[PDB]
Amino acid sequence: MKIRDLLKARRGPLFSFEFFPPKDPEGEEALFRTLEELKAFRPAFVSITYGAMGSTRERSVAWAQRIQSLGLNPLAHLTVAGQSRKEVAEVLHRFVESGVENLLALRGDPFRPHPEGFRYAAELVALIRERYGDRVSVGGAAYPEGHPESESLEADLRHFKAKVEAGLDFAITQLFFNNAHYFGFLERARRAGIGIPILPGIMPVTSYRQLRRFTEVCGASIPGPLLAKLERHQDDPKAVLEIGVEHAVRQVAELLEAGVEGVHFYTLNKSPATRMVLERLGLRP
Amino acid sequence: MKIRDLLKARRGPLFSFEFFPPKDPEGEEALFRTLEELKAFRPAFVSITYGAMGSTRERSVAWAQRIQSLGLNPLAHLTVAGQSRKEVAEVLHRFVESGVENLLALRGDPPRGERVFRPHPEGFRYAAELVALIRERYGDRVSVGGAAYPEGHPESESLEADLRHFKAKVEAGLDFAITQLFFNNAHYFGFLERARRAGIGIPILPGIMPVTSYRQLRRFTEVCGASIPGPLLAKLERHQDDPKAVLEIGVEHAVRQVAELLEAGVEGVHFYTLNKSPATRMVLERLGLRP
Ligand SMILES: Cc1cc2nc3c(=O)[nH]c(=O)nc-3n(C[C@H](O)[C@H](O)[C@H](O)COP(=O)(O)OP(=O)(O)OC[C@H]3O[C@@H](n4cnc5c(N)ncnc54)[C@H](O)[C@@H]3O)c2cc1C
Ligand SMILES: Cc1cc2nc3c(=O)[nH]c(=O)nc-3n(C[C@H](O)[C@H](O)[C@H](O)COP(=O)(O)OP(=O)(O)OC[C@H]3O[C@@H](n4cnc5c(N)ncnc54)[C@H](O)[C@@H]3O)c2cc1C
Ligand code: NA
Ligand code: NA
């Protein structure tokens, strides 16, 4: 089912999970195990990421199909970096010919475009709509704290708006650790005339180091209390997992009481954190 | 001049500096040096903090008097913690008697180590009650400000409660507010759009702290609830043992922040100086704002 329709039909929240194409047999087995655990929560959709320059193209397709084989509804990510327009179009056709009806149109990271490539995710959005109309549902990235490369936050929101207007049905946010970042962004988007659902992206912390590297790359901020607490227990993995889960639970309880349309979980191909968050919220069907 | 009137009269930004009353001659000499340096930037006001439970209230009055006599325009902070209503009204009166016409009404914090705030048995519980007192007694003859928390106050049950409590505080009779420190302008802009959508129309001035010490940043944000951008955090952490590199990183970060707030047309910027001149000077110099 197209996410655009799920969002209107379902009055309770959509839970989604994000996974990446593992790069070796061991990784693949780990993801299969993670899938077997998380599918019992009956996610509204499951995303499969795409290597920035087209490096995972085959594996992304194969995992999209595998998600379908489990009875789950894939959201297929697709990037424009490092690919001709024709390459991007070919991969897109292969997703669509597989029965994938949900795409997440992204730029990807290296930034100079491919000589016959696109420059912006909005050009892929426009491609998809030009070729497939409403036969698919298209999402894009949003950055509550602003994309690192944007000259200003005003330009960031304007650029996001242009992307929406290319034909987005929904957006998924970059990770954030204080719900104020999300609600702020949401209000600013609405003031800018944007009406599409915008789903909060949540990463439950399972490792101090990982938190540090992720926020460093993507530009997200960490609350001072959370940082201190993680820093103290950084050497006790069980404590860290506990602290991350508690924090995501606090985050997600408020998002749901506020009426968000769904929550997208960055799982990093592991089940425990996401499982614990959902079980603590009373959300195991 | 009332900050209420400066904000309406002036179409460009107000610049303001926050200072704390030093405890001793050495601290006083240091602040007078900082003041001498920073007064060149011609701030529209200068704020003087108040020690949470009133034990240093006469230092706060003395510094308000010093600032007023230096031709600078004091914004006197005042808390309700650990003090009776009478005690609070007495200090309030002294400020006004000394010519102060701008007050920042605050709750104050319980002692370090205590997690429950409990009012004085005959004191106020919320800043809003101080606001109401001020207006009851002085009407519009003074200008009254409050605090705002773009990332939500650590004690608020939710961000929705946070905003509703802020709105009630505004409605008790605020002319402006100043934010808690923040390190990404998205936090400030988001809060503004939330406040507006809640029907708050007072000017809300961003509060900026230029980072001069890794460990201080960590403690302040641990206490405040504020967040640190991952890139900034990464850089400061790498260089935390070189104070000059930290100062340069903190200055550069604040320059980027302030440059965007001014271009967006904020009504001013309030600097948390911690009684030091170098970082704030450098920020403003680099923006070309030395007259
Ligand atoms: C939910 C989610 C999933 C992701 N999945 C993947 C993935 O599978 N693979 C991957 O490689 N990356 C992925 N990313 C990351 C993404 O590719 C990077 O964040 C990338 O740097 C930006 O992609 P975008 O589509 O958000 O960019 P765009 O919307 O193209 O924006 C890129 C930059 O250009 C600016 N810009 C936009 N339009 C204009 C314009 N008209 N003029 C000038 N500047 C403009 C933007 O403000 C930004 O600075 C994901 C991100 C999110 C939030
Ligand atoms: C610019 C600035 C300057 C400051 N200067 C000083 C200073 O000089 N001295 C000092 O000691 N502290 C100072 N503070 C810190 C301040 O005292 C603390 O943040 C304190 O914890 C809260 O004070 P407040 O006036 O913001 O609180 P209030 O507005 O009283 O709010 C306190 C808490 O109770 C909640 N609340 C408010 N109204 C209600 C209600 N009716 N019912 C239920 N809950 C409610 C709030 O949401 C919050 O959770 C300053 C803060 C800022 C931003
Ligand atoms: Na819905
Ligand atoms: Na003004």
Residue numbers in the entry:
A (entry chain B): 1 to 110, 117 to 291
B (entry chain A): 1 to 291
Authors' text:
The flavoprotein methylenetetrahydrofolate reductase (MTHFR) catalyzes the reduction of N5, N10-methylenetetrahydrofolate (CH2-H4folate) to N5-methyltetrahydrofolate (CH3-H4folate), committing a methyl group from the folate cycle to the methionine one. MTHFR requires flavin adenine nucleotide (FAD) as a noncovalently bound cofactor, which acts as an intermediary electron shuttle. All MTHFRs share a highly conserved catalytic domain, despite varying oligomerization states, such as a dimer in Thermus thermophilus HB8 (tMTHFR) versus a tetramer in Escherichia coli (eMTHFR). All MTHFR catalytic domains share the same β8α8 barrel topology, a typical triose phosphate isomerase barrel structure.
In the absence of folate, two different FAD-bound tMTHFR structures with different intermonomer interfaces have been described. In one of the structures, only one active site in the dimer is occupied by FAD (half-FAD occupancy, dimer mode 1) while both active sites are occupied in the other (full-FAD occupancy, dimer mode 2). It is worth noting that tMTHFR purifies in the half-FAD occupancy state; only the addition of excess FAD leads to the observance of the full-FAD occupancy state. In contrast, in the folate-free tMTHFR structure, the distance between Thr and Glu is found to be 5.7 Å, suggesting that the triad expansion to include the interacting Thr49 and formation of a tetrad is triggered or is coupled to binding of a specific folate form. Indeed, the Thr coordination in the folate-free tMTHFR structure is very similar to that in the eMTHFR structure with or without CH3-H4folate. It has to be noted that while the Thr residue exhibits a dynamic behavior, the positions of the Ser, His, and Glu residues in the triad remain largely unchanged.
